[PDB]
């Protein structure tokens, strides 16, 4: 088993997938390499939205299968500084 994921750099990361692993576990497994909100990360097909309280076995298909992962920003709007 091996998927490719691409970043926002464009490094493609190597993985293996999980029963039990969930949107949630994900984000926990980010408690090694800080820098970026573990909340701000997100699986999406570009026009289809995954759901975060979604499981894996819920979205688990078969190997040979592109990921793709955004970091949009939310974190309230800017103030336009004239």
Known sequence: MQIFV???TGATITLEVES???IDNVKS???AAPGIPPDQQELI???KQLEDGRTLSDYNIQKESTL???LRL???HH???H
Request: hydrophobic content about 30%; proline content about 0%.
């Open 74 to 76: 939310r974190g309230g």
């Open 6 to 8: 691409k970043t926002l």
């Open 20 to 22: 039990s692993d969930t």
């Open 79 to 81: 103030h336009h500084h």
């Open 29 to 31: 497994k980010i408690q």
């Open 45 to 47: 097909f570009a026009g």
């Open 68 to 70: 793709h992962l955004v």
